[PDB]
From a paper:
Amaryllidaceae alkaloids, such as the Alzheimer’s medication galantamine, are complex plant secondary metabolites with recognized therapeutic value. 4′-O-methylnorbelladine (4NB) is the branchpoint intermediate for the entire amaryllidaceae alkaloid (AA) family, and therefore was the target compound for biosensor generation. Since norbelladine 4′-O-methyltransferase (Nb4OMT) from the wild daffodil Narcissus sp. aff. pseudonarcissus, is directly responsible for 4NB production from norbelladine, we chose this as a starting point for development of a fuller pathway. Furthermore, LC/MS analysis identified 3’-O-Methylnorbelladine as a minor component, indicating that the wild-type Nb4OMT enzyme was not highly regiospecific.
To better understand the mechanism underlying the three beneficial substitutions in the Nb4OMTE36P/G40E/A53M variant, we determined the structure of the Nb4OMTE36P/G40E/A53M variant in complex with S-adenosyl-L-homocysteine (SAH) at 2.4 Å resolution. The Nb4OMT variant exists as a homodimer in the crystalline form, consistent with its size exclusion chromatogram. The overall fold of the protein was almost identical to the predicted AlphaFold2 structure, except for the N-terminal region. AlphaFold2 predicts that Lys13 forms tight salt bridge interaction with Asp155, Asp181, and Asn182 in the enzyme active site, while the experimental structure showed that Asp155, Asp181, and Asn182 instead coordinate a Ca2+ ion and Lys13 forms hydrogen bonds with the backbone of Tyr186 and the sidechain of Tyr194. The experimental structure of Nb4OMTE36P/G40E/A53M provides a basis for the improved thermostability of the enzyme (an increase in Tm from 52.8 °C to 58.4 °C). The A53M substitution inserts a larger hydrophobic methionine inside the hydrophobic pocket formed by Trp50, Tyr81, and Tyr108, stabilizing the active site of Nb4OMT. The E36P-G40E double mutant shifts a glutamate from position 36 to position 40 and thereby preserves the salt bridge interaction with Lys118 while proline capping the alpha helix. To better determine how the A53M substitution affects the substrate recognition of Nb4OMT, GNINA 1.0 was used to dock norbelladine into the crystal structure of Nb4OMTE36P/G40E/A53M with SAH and Ca2+ already in the active site (based on Fo-Fc electron densities). In the docked structure, the Ca2+ ion positions the catechol moiety of the substrate adjacent to the SAH binding site. A sulfur-π interaction between the catechol group of norbelladine and Methionine 53 may also restrict the rotation of the catechol group, thereby reducing the cross-methylation of the 3’ position and improving specificity.
Numbering used by the authors:
A (entry chain B): 9 to 239
B (entry chain A): 7 to 239
Amino acid sequence: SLVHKNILHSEDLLKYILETSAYPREHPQLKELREVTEKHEWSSMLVPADEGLFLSMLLKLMNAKRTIEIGVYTGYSLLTTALALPEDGKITAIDVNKSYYEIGLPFIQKAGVEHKINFIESEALPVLDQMLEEMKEEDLYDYAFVDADKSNYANYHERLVKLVRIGGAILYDNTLWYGSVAYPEYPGLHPEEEVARLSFRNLNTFLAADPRVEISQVSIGDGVTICRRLY
Amino acid sequence: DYSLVHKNILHSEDLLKYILETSAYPREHPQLKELREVTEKHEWSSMLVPADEGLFLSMLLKLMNAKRTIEIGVYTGYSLLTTALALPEDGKITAIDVNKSYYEIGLPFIQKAGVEHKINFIESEALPVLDQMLEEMKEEDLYDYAFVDADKSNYANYHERLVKLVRIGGAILYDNTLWYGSVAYPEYPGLHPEEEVARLSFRNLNTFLAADPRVEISQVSIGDGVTICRRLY
Ligand SMILES: Nc1ncnc2c1ncn2[C@@H]1O[C@H](CSCC[C@H](N)C(=O)O)[C@@H](O)[C@H]1O
Ligand SMILES: Nc1ncnc2c1ncn2[C@@H]1O[C@H](CSCC[C@H](N)C(=O)O)[C@@H](O)[C@H]1O
Ligand SMILES: [Ca+2]
Ligand SMILES: [Ca+2]
Ligand SMILES: [Ca+2]
Ligand SMILES: [Ca+2]
């Protein structure tokens, strides 16, 4: 339905970006994790390889050390994060499906960065409330990546603006939702796509008016909105 | 005379319009919006950095805590003003452009923003300025951040100077690396002869940058394509 679409004007340009600039810079275990995942039935949930390099560039430019990832799946962006962080970096990875994670776990292990990862098999919302209860100022995160159930993004935001340090970054994936967010009405979507589509329009509008953060909506992948905490 | 000026890399004008009106304009500094609306009246307004790309550059600058930057290709100063507003109050920018009169169009808005003091505008071709910067720069003065948005067929020449003028871990950004999507094909019909030279140089630069061990890169399909390079050694 929506997964067949690109935000760029042609698949030729997207493949040009992937082949010229993405794959030649892809870590060998990241390539292996993607190629196994591509044969999985839910391979459409995979974060694009060009977005992945953009994620690690942010992580290194901002010198992130402690990050949280919501929505792991087979672990492409998680492995991308663990490779970008220094060897003493630490990641809190939350996903409901442990089996999805164990698909990519051997490649995280072969990369030697499993020690940076604390995987939590849970729904994300209770974990964040739990983290709110037992965290103080020097446990705050530098970086957060939200890539899970779309209709819960606004709930994650209310908790992540407190679990991320001042000056830290929160990133929301699929904010352009295959272009469908550009219109108030959109024909012929299945109810789950329409729920997510309406949730992103409210989220994009809300985040543009949120005095707690600066934002930057980036037209990469399916849309990523970078949020930097102000206070 | 340039044919690709109005071509979008996104799939529809409405999607770009949505991004600008939802996420770009509501977060645009009033003097940045003032400068853009004046520039869009000007002849070569096509050279203006898109507003959604402006907030991306600003976001990069604050996250990486840049304090000393260099800007190659100023025009009326949209990305320059974007940089000056993002940098700390004691920040420093070296801005280079052949055209001083273009800069003076946006200089009133840079002044009303209170950030002119951070800017050292140099009216010159960039290559001679970079070559003399190489002579008199100690490793304490290396720039954190370089934005290249000038003559496209010179990007590779600038690259050899900027890998030495930017600190290790610093960022070098190349604008227009997608050239309106025309880089996706070996040949592209009906371009200005100057347009084609730029199209061929970006294809060479994109392949070269992907194999350059001195930097890690990420090509971002925002605006007309931005390639962030991070110096490794
Ligand atoms: N409520 C919830 N709590 C935690 N994880 C959830 C969740 N709802 C959905 N998810 C998970 O979020 C994932 C989204 S796909 C994420 C892709 C991954 N970031 C990559 O790099 O490819 C799915 O694996 C799903 O199991
Ligand atoms: N060789 C050269 N050295 C320095 N500047 C040059 C140059 N060749 C072209 N330029 C300048 O580079 C500019 C490119 S347009 C740059 C737009 C600007 N960065 C913005 O934010 O809108 C033009 O103004 C042109 O005068
Ligand atoms: Ca489970
Ligand atoms: Ca996603
Ligand atoms: Ca001149
Ligand atoms: Ca440009």
